[PDB]
Design a protein around this ligand. Sequence first.
Ligand SMILES: [Mg+2]
Lengths: 224, 136, 350, 99, 227
Amino acid sequence: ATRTQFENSNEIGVFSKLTNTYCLVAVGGSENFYSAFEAELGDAIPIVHTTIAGTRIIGRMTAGNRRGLLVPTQTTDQELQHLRNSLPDSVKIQRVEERLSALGNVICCNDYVALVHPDIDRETEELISDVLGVEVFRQTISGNILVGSYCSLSNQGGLVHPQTSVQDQEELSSLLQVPLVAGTVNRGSSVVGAGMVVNDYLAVTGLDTTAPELSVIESIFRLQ
Amino acid sequence: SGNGAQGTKFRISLGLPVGAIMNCADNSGARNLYIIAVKGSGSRLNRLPAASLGDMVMATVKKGKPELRKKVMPAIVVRQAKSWRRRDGVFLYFEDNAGVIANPKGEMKGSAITGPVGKECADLWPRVASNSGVVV
Amino acid sequence: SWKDIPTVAPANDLLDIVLNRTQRKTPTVIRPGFKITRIRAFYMRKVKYTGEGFVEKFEDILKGFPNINDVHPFHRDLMDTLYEKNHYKISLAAISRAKSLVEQVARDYVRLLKFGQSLFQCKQLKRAALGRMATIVKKLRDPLAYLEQVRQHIGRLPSIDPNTRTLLICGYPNVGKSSFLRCITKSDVDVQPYAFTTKSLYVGHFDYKYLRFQAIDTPGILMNNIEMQSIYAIAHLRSCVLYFMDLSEQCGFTIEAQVKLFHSIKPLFANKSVMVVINKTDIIRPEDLDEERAQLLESVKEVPGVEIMTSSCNVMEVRNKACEKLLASRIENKVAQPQARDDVKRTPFI
Amino acid sequence: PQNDYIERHIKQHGKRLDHEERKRKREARESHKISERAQKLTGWKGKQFAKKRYAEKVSMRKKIKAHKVIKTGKSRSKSWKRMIFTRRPVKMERIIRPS
Amino acid sequence: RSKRSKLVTLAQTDKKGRENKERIFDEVREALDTYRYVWVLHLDDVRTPVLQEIRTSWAGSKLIMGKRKVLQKALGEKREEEYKENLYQLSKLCSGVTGLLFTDEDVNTVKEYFKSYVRSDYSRPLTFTIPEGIVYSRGGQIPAEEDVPMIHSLEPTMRNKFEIPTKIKAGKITIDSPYLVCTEGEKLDVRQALILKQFGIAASEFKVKVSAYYDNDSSTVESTNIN
RNA sequence: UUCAUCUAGACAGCCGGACGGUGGCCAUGGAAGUCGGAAUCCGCUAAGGAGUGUGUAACAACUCACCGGCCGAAUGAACUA
RNA sequence: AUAACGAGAUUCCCACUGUCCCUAUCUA
RNA sequence: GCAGUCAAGCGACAUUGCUAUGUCGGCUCUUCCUAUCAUACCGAAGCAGAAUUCGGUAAGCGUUGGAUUGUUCACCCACUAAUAGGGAACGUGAGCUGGGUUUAGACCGUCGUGAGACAGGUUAGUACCCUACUGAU
Ligand SMILES: [Mg+2]
């Protein structure tokens, strides 16, 4: 577990996306945010200065795993070309023409299982399943429609927003086949998915994250 | 710019002056918002404060759950419905002007946002983007 | 803390500032040839502005100053012992009375001034109102002078939550409690050998098991206000009490005196997770505590809720045991599983 | 914060290396500054400065002992009433006593 | 109008004026005949307790001090104006801060006592060096285990006047290197003398000295000079 | 204009002394010349105030009144227009 | 000695609109 | 202010108890003053940081949108760095508005024998000359 910050935003997940084989960060501001990942990731996996539709919220406009990456229609051809160049052939890049461009919020997924907004058409669901090679299910966390913003998942474990009920927690844990814990991040923030980015060996959250929150994140994700 | 903004604000056309009615876009139970003032606007003689996409305004709920009426809380405009200059080089406008209610810290009252959300508002407000299922 | 109070000026300075502000802001030039309505409005506006200026300053004092009446048993007792709560309330009431008198004068003279028929009459009425306000402010000299000092003192007081998990370092002075406080937590406090090094309840923060903690060192107890301040903190705070005792001959008072004092304060300690710590172990080797005087510790042991800790300044052991003792009382007073969905195991990709 | 830090910090580190000398120089310059201010500080400020200086001299001297026509209705020509307890009817009373 | 202002304060003491000098002149004149032997001592610098101890260290006698010019007037600064036989010569030898010990026991005894009278004195000596670390109250002349660190209040005095480059971090006064204060066998400067006095190093010793003596029957100056 | 000290030494400046009973009686945990109350004397001086202020928790030390010398001729206070 | 009705006096709601934000253009 | 208190001078400073009978207001416009609300530069304040008080020069700029008064009386919400006080016949009727004041009609209350009046409330009401300035031969 490592503490970092955007220019001044503690919602790391909004401006960055982290996976087991690649990471994405916003280009705005300075390289202080970029260097934070280097301290922990170094050059083991690529780190790409990429924008999506000209926004700095690439962490929420895109979703993917070590096997593939997805971008919305608003992404310009230049951004797609840069992403293709800056990532290995083992990481697929597929443009998505879905109605809901918020892939990062609509889709919450790990290397094995994925959750999507039920409004997503079956065609895009099949595309996500094929590109990412993961099981895709239509589910919500205790009525939270945006699974990608209220949930965080990884091969080691996952974390959901505190309002999740015990029955919902059990159902989601059974479906995703990984341990889950209901808690807050960034000093009581309920948007766990957007607050922090986590992978199988590295969790990055905002400075506001309290020590109990960091300990819970480490324990659930088995980072130490 | 008020608290919660993570960057400079683009110069865009003024869509909603004081007293403009904008539809709600969150599950907080409110349906319409009445703008009484615009935060960060420099008042000048004869010039009615006006907001735009991504702006934070103070409004009182006129229709919806009565519990939210008669109280003024900060609101963020998600749709402008007036053509504004996008740096990509397109004069785009939304079908209907709409806004969302949030605290000064930028936390969204509603767990999720419904309908399209302007890029210039989602980008400036991380919480809006996180709680928005559609961008542009 | 109550640093929000900006300042309170003395009566003379307050009056001078108010009068200068009223003179500079409001218009100053009027002529007898102007309509009587113009002169009346001018003088009434001047009087109203002066009254409002006097009233607003008093409001910042009454509202800014925290009313000592039953703020909290811990804070209230310390404030009473530091500022003579009776005197504090008397001064606040006097300031409220002065503000009420100023408001009454402003309301009355404005009502009287509207009947003026000449420039001289209106000028005299305005001067009388200003003199009334000035005299009322002047009579408030001593309350404002005392409030300036109490504001300067209160603004630098330590800030603590009585119900938070904490431990109070207690015992006789010159034992070494200052060194223990300085080492356990980051806090700059004198470590001089004389028995009154600590003038107030110094505080310092430290963390244990992710739980916020802060240690408070007593000024010393052997009633004097300084000694009484620690007693009121002990009686009202839920914090654990850490009675430090010096076993070495580096204290004028004998060992028996420390044990007798601990027994005397036993009723206050007993229900607050008492723990006894022996200090200066580095130069005594308590093994020298022969059975002829070992009865002193046995008497302390008569209460099952206390124990003796040998520390030299074990520095972290004492903190850990104190935290455990506090948790023992506080807890009493206070994840999902996958099922694996299959027999095939999937491992993380590192 | 925490109970007279300023005094403790001064004890631990002292004042500026040129603080006492500057204070002495300012004390010496006080006489020249006072003399200049008497000629300067025009306007009302001069009056207050002179009054305070004279009061200061008074303190030293004390310490030396060490050991109406009113018109009614919709017309200005009806100058009937006058102005100076069950007030009489207005149509009947001729002299008005304000409350 | 531009004139120097006075820093006078309402003290509890006032100048004695010319009356005291005139009274002392008459007292000296009377003592010149009351007692047999007279002496012209030198006490340019002596602590008051030393003088008080001297005033009681011998039997009934009068130790007379005062202004040098007043004493010369009492004795007379001219042969024609001399008060007593050849008293002008005795006054001619009065150079520094002089005092007269009027007594009649023995001429030899007084000079012997002056020779044998020795007491500690300041430098106004052997070289001294300040310790290379924290400076103690005695400046390292005694073991640090017994002395106490210097009070931080006097550090400005050390810096501004004594010239020592003192610094205060962990405000117990400390210096970056040992500082040489005094050399071997030399008249210390005013700053060095003040530094030694502050440290309490009273290495020097003072012994009373007399330039000449006089007797009421000898009618001449006893030109005996001892220190 | 009048006092007040002046070549047996006026003021500026330099430096030395500025003492013992006594760390005076009360309150004190400390308060020793100084956070405070009433007091304010004895012994020796050329002088030295139970101490004018700075001051370390007390001390201490520094420093004021006062005195000693070297500096060598007017200076200092108030008032008047 | 109170229904209808009114170029009667005043208050409010829907639509509305250049009265205004902020003015711009045209025709004789 | 009333009634005292002592006392440098010929009574200063300090000191003792309580204590609307008028119509001006608003939209635009230009200029001026500082007795500085905000902005620049500084000093003193228990200024540890943050925030804040006062004081010194400095008028260039900025000093608002609204519930609401015909209003003279004058109170609140919000933004903003702040929403400071005044003058130019308390500028601005051949600039506008007549909003309010004030003719001729009419309704209600008092008095008056009466005609009528009000202590009063309501209703409806009639520059093409010279110079200055802006442009231009
Ligand atoms: Mg100690």
